[PDB]
């Protein structure tokens, strides 16, 4: 345990289901977002733990934990799909965990208006039909 005035109330995981390509659920693991690690408990033995920001692009759909990490190890390279009810917690948290370490979370949808970027077209010219 450790005798140095160290509390235990600091565990935030999420029972996420490990789904395959199709998405018919495989088993069920505990997604953990420690102070510096995405430890995805599974089979009470295998721990798919990344370095948090070691990912590449992470998303979620209502109650679906989606996270993709570049080539490294554990399971391999590719996108990951998970089914949980605390999808919000995990995401929301992560989004915060990133701001704490200035981590990269290039967010695309941010409700725009009219058009921020510009494409090659102007100036225009009359064709004269």
């Amino acid at each position: 345990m450790g005798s140095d005035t160290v509390p235990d109330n600091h565990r935030n995981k999420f029972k996420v289901i490990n789904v395959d390509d199709d998405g018919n659920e495989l088993g069920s693991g505990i997604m953990e977002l420690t102070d510096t690690e995405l430890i995805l408990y599974t089979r009470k033995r295998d721990s798919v733990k990344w370095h948090y920001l070691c990912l590449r692009r992470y998303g979620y759909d209502s109650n679906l934990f989606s996270f993709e990490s570049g080539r490294r190890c554990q399971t391999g390279q590719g996108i990951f799909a998970f089914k949980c009810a605390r999808a919000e917690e995990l995401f929301n948290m992560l989004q915060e965990i990133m701001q704490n370490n200035s981590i990269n979370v290039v967010e695309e949808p941010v409700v725009e208006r009219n058009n921020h970027q510009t494409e090659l077209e102007v100036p225009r010219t009359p064709r004269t039909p």
Binding site: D21, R43, F82
Partner: peptide
């Protein structure tokens, strides 16, 4: 594979958001 849980998708999914964390 090392067993693990997090399966592989190798294909995007109908997500509601879009935050690509490098």
């Amino acid at each position: 594979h090392s067993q693990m849980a997090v399966h592989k998708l190798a294909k995007s999914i109908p997500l509601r958001r879009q935050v690509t964390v490098s």
